[PDB]
Amino acid sequence: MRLINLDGRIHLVTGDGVVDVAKASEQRFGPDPQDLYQHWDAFQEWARTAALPAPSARVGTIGSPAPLPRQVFAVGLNYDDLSKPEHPVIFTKFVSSITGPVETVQLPAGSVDWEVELVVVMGRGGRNIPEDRAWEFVAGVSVGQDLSERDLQLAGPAPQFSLAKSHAGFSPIGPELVTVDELPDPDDLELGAEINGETVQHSRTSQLIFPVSNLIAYLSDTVELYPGDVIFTGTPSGVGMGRNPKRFLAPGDELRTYITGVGEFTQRFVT
Amino acid sequence: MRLINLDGRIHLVTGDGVVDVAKASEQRFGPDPQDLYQHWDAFQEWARTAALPAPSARVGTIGSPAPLPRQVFAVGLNYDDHATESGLSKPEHPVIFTKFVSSITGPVETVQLPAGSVDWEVELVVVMGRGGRNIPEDRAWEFVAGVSVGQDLSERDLQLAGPAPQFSLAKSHAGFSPIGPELVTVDELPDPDDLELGAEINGETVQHSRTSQLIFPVSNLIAYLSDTVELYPGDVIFTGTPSGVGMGRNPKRFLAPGDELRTYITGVGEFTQRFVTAD
Ligand SMILES: [Zn+2]
Ligand SMILES: [Zn+2]
């Protein structure tokens, strides 16, 4: 199954077009994307058995498939490419920074860096979620950027990472929510990023130090996860911090972000 | 004005009792507390001229006055003497992390102790009444709905472990973010920037200070945060804790099974919690 938020209304992707979920379900589900996750089990049963109308043209502004998660978990230092962290390093990206895959991103002053990430949206919640069943709790996955202003991120005593990753538009997610049954190997997805056509990140999520199932289980051993919660699962090497010379996003740069089998989007940066 | 969340329904404090807002307002406001913050000015105008029913007795679970904030901002090292006792350098800008919303409760009678080193932190809690980006410092209190009492309970082992230690998860165990009992609006405070706060364990003071000792006062926090994020009505700010935390003592002391922790802000509220383990 694939879902897309168009002009604030959640749609099923059906064939080469879209089906408005609220209209098709006679207002039983939707239109608000975030409200679907609180009805997730009933929604999926409906979507997979109901007689859907013929699809409509895919038009409108693409929003985040999870625009208002109750909790946002973002992971640091989670790719292979020494001593590994013993447990996931966890911070947040504040929800006011979440957007769809919009055309442009404002560059604040500082050193703004790119991070392609697999985004996981929960479809079922709880505490102590068993790792070996964790994918059954996932509604689906999407493409994300964890845009990061490195000066604010790393400065001061015991630097806490969330605010520097929470500037306006620093958490784009989209274009589609892609359910697990669409992924050839949910635990081994190719992902990458290009700046002005030039590869700056390229890896596979098989390189996650803590895979998706482990992140879900681990988080749930401290917090209660909720349907609709969002996990930014971490980013591979190739960030501009790590380049020699060190390179950061500049006005005019075009950042293409992709995950194979999931989707892609491109954003331009302006000052 | 004072508000209290009872069994999930927001109430207005009227004299010695309370009034259910949704019933009193004929469903125009409430019963969800966050609905009031989203429509704060309209709510306050209605309350100013409303004909309320007779007050009822406070009964039910006291919940957080802001039980489902869209964003939670938790501030580290925001009193100089707590900075000194942490072993870290004094900050030049607010240290910002979060306490995940699943950890927010009201002033519940008992808190489960996870394994580790669980530490106390009395804090002034701020609930936003108006949102925005680039809120000016000299207007910031006008964007505040009210204040309440909070604990930033902290499992210090997880908080400080591993490379690049990030504080949020250790402060987000079940029940680690109690807020309450009441929201108190700013006009009830003699000086909103100078409130006495403290904490006692088994009747012995372990924290006692005044929020006039904040390194970054409430107005500065709101201005600073809003220069990066959009604050929303109903958002929660844990403004930081004064000195006296257990990890700063010699020897270090942490909450133990059976400990009773009383947390207060004088003239605003208090609550007492007992700690128990899973055995
Ligand atoms: Zn990241
Ligand atoms: Zn604190």
In SS3 terms, chain B reads as: CEEEEECCEEEEEECCEEEEHHHHCCCCCCCCHHHHHHCHHHHHHHHHHCCCCCCECCCCCEECCCCCCCCEEEEECCEHHHHHHCCCCCCCCCEEECCCHHHEECCCCEEEECCCCEECCEEEEEEECCCECCCCHHHHHHHEEEEEEEECCEEHHHHHCCCCCCCCHHHCCCCCEEEEEEEEEHHHCCCCCCCEEEEEECCEEEEEEEHHHECCCHHHHHHHHHCCCCECCCCEEECCCCCCCHHHCCCCCCCCCCCEEEEEECCCEEEEEEEEECC
Looking only at the bridges linking them, the beta strands covering A138-145 and A171-178 are antiparallel
Tell how far CA B207 is from the center of its chain: 16
Distance CA A35, CA A55 (A): 22
CA-wise closest residue to A268 among A147, A97, A141: A147
Ligand 1 midpoint to CA A78 (Å): 9
CA-nearest of A191, A169, A186, A177 to A228 is: A177
Q: Compare all CA atoms of chain B with the CA of A125 and give the residue at the minimum distance.
A: B102
Residues of B in contact with A127 (CB under 8 A): 174
Count residue pairs from A and B with Cβ separation < 8 A.
107
Instruction: Tell me, rounded to whole angstroms, the distance of Cα B171 from its chain centroid.
Output: 13
| Tokens coding A222 | 């401290």
Place of tokens 């190739």: A238
Are B245 and B207 in contact, with CB atoms under 8 Å apart? yes
Find the A109 Cα to ligand 2 centroid distance in Å: 28
Q: Residues A48, A19: contact at Cβ < 8 Å?
A: no
Tokens for B165? 């230690």
Resolution in angstroms for this experimental structure? 1.8
What single-letter DSSP state applies at residue A62?
E
CATH class of A66-271: alpha beta
Q: Give the chain A residue whose CA is nearest to the CA of B227.
A: A167
R_g (Cα) of chain A, nearest Å: 18
Q: Give the end-to-end CA distance of chain A in Å, rounded to a whole number.
A: 38
Tell the residue number behind the tokens 């064939």, with chain if given.
A15
Given an 8 Å threshold on Cβ–Cβ distance, is A223 in contact with B89?
no
d(CA B80, CA B82): 5
Asked if B70's CB is within 8 angstroms of A68's CB, the reply is yes
DSSP A119-172: EEEESS-BSS--GGGGGGGEEEEEEEE--EEHHHHH-SSS---TGGG-STTSEE
Structure tokens belonging to residue B138: 């000299």
Segments making up each domain of chain B, as ranges:
1-65, 66-279
**Among B73, B1, B74, CA closest to B37:** B1
Burial A79-106 (b: 16+ CB within 10 A, else e): beeeeebeebbbbbbbbbbbbbbbeebe
SS3 A192: strand
Distance CA A188, CA A138 (A): 16
- Return the ligand number nearest the Cα of B151: 2
| Rounded Cα distance, B108 and B271, in Å | 9
Q: Does domain B66-279 have CATH number 3.40.1010.20?
A: no
CA distance A188 to A201: 16
Q: How many angstroms separate the CA atoms of A225 and A217, rounded?
A: 10
A117 marked ligand binding residue: yes
- Whole-angstrom distance, CA of residue B149 vs CA of residue B270: 7
Experimental method: X-ray
Q: Which residues contact A198 (CB under 8 A, 6 or more apart)?
A: none
Name every residue whose Cβ is closer than 8 Å to that of residue A91 and which is 6 or more positions away in sequence: A74, A76, A160, A161, A162, A165, B97, B98, B166, B168
Q: How far apart are CA A139 and CA A171, in angstroms?
A: 19
Helical segments of chain A, H only: 21-24, 33-37, 40-49, 150-154, 212-220
